């Protein structure tokens, strides 16, 4: 057989994807809460592998979300249950995931990686489901991924559209509903209809409302039968010691009272960024959010995300996803952080 | 109309879910079963941004590593154990389906279970009768075959794999797979290292990990040394943000030059516990050979060697059984853990009289 170079023995699909990738003062361009919220270990045990699956971190998250431990996974944040549903579910290059753009960017970067193709119908105007776009595209779907609230949208996917998308997949494809921003609108979660749908799986992380993206732990959420499933593909030690010592503290009583308090702040926090933006010149339109960011729309709003970048200001331009010319991506941090941002908005002239 | 598990990858629904067999500690059980450093070192945080998502590869632990490795910077990436970085070869280079691995029993177990969760096939080549490479049987099985693992020196039966035999392998597989050297146990015998011999080898990979000689298994750190074109590849499939804030911190604070010192200091320790625990087995009725090893832990043949797991396992004394490895029936491992568990092994295996 002939030799080939490095870059040819990789995969195909490998050598051809692009690979998610990444100066100021001011950063709201990731949705991490604004400020840190400090966590000592408990637990010198470093010597020894962890837990596959840390029993207090289980069930405390399976009492914080009001489910069985047998219907909770932990992984390395909601980005690694994205993988272990396509790694378990999507055979490559003969089944397909579906996701609804514009929305959140890793379903898709997964996919590609583990080589399964991707299905997209976008969302409609108000960027809720296209159900019938849906219904046609199907054929050959074993996992479709829905962001409620959305990313970078802000809205909640109607429920009845859930439903409806549920019973089309009833016995053909897994369900997931992505509730990284549901503490910020808790009365919004599918986790309370696992009972109704056996296909049906909610996204959960710490890394949002719970003010820990640098501990990397995320949450599925799932009937007991799928759980076993996505465990027959998870790493033996996903979760080193300290992330699930700090969870295990974060997701304390007390910790949930923590983050409901960190919640409100940010509510209040949207509120007046949402108001005092609408009254500025650049702004053309500022979307109703359920989350810790919200989208708008700018005039020349590639010059005003360069212009408040070379500020130090680091918001996430949108103006390549599909509807979303024009549109930035905030997200709410401190009131300081928010007026940062409308002082500049303001000074723009445009 | 399917139900859940018929939805799944038809590999996926043979696979078996991760067992731990480890009761919490506070029942006293005395754990040598998974090569863990006995005895934990403390560290502390000294970075709250836990709020903040952490570098995707960070800066300090690679460059940290790579000094202590003796390698650049761009040779090396850091991911969740040395366990990812067998995902990522795999992941990388080994179309399912298509592609195959290659290993050689009786070795660890992750290559294959990797595999066959991608789903990709796995080749073996059982290796000689004193566990050297059998590189006919290999260069018989190559067809096909994108990632070579080899473990040297090799678990579970601890011996350096010949380095002429490694260059062999080397050129044999030259423009047709990847040879990964498994060097989870390097830090027993640094002087084998292969991490030198980047330059020479376009398709050498190198893992090594945290969790052995460093004490560190709690943290989940791992490494894969390579040519920076090997590397660049690997990070196209990694996940975004691998190491955790915490890890990533602990890590740089173990990788400090004081830190490398401090790891030194406990493979002499481990070196010294090894030499006495092989010659008290060997004394022992029920021994019938214990095998001379370059790691922190030795394999021994023990008569009825089932009946004798279960029995120092019945008194909580864990060790891991290889009964059912290719050419190792009677063997069980023997982790090197402090003097007082060493003697409780002991102890233990003079009274099966
Ligand atoms: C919609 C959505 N899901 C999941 C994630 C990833 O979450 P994690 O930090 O738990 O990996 C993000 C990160 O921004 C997100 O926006
Ligand atoms: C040969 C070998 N390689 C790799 C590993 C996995 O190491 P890590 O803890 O870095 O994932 C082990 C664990 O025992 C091992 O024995
Ligand atoms: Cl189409």
């Not at 996701?99 to 108000?126: F, H, K, N, Q, W």
């Not at 998308?165 to 309370?192: H, S, W």
Request: aromatic letters at 8%; proline letters at 6%; a negative charge.
């Amino acid at each position: 057989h002939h030799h080939m170079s490095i870059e040819d023995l990789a995969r195909a699909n490998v050598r051809a994807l692009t690979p998610y990738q990444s100066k100021g003062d001011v950063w709201l361009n990731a949705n991490e809460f604004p400020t840190a919220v400090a966590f000592q270990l408990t637990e010198q045990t470093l010597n020894r592998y962890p837990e596959p699956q840390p029993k207090a971190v289980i069930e405390s998250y399976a009492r914080y979300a009001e489910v069985k431990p047998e219907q909770v996974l932990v992984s390395r944040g909601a980005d690694e249950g994205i993988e272990l549903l396509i790694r378990a579910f999507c055979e490559p290059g003969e089944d397909a995931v579906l996701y609804c753009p514009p929305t959140y960017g890793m379903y898709s970067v997964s996919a590609e990686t583990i080589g399964v193709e991707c299905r997209t119908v976008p969302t409609l105007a108000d960027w809720q489901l296209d159900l019938p776009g849906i219904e046609a595209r199907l054929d050959g779907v074993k996992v479709v991924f829905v962001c409620s609230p959305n990313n970078p949208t802000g809205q909640i996917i109607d429920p009845q559209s859930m439903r409806d998308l549920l019973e089309m997949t009833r016995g053909k494809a897994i369900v997931v509903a992505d509730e990284a921003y549901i503490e910020f609108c808790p009365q919004a979660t599918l986790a309370g209809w696992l009972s109704d749908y056996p296909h049906l799986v909610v996204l959960r992380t710490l890394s949002k409302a719970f003010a820990l993206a640098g501990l990397r732990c995320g949450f599925t959420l799932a009937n007991a039968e799928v759980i076993n499933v996505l465990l027959k593909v998870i790493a033996p030690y996903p979760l080193s010691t300290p992330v699930a010592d700090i969870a295990a503290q974060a997701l304390s009583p007390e910790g949930i009272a923590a983050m409901r308090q960190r919640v409100a702040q940010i509510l209040d926090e949207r509120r007046y960024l949402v108001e005092q933006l609408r009254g500025i010149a650049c702004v053309e339109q500022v979307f109703d959010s359920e989350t810790n960011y919200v989208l708008a729309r700018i005039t020349a709003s590639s010059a005003v995300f360069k212009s408040l970048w070379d500020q130090g200001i680091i918001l996430r331009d949108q103006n390549k996803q599909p509807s979303l010319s024009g549109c930035l991506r905030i997200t709410i941090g401190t009131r300081a952080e928010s007026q940062r941002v409308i002082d500049a908005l303001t000074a723009e002239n445009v």
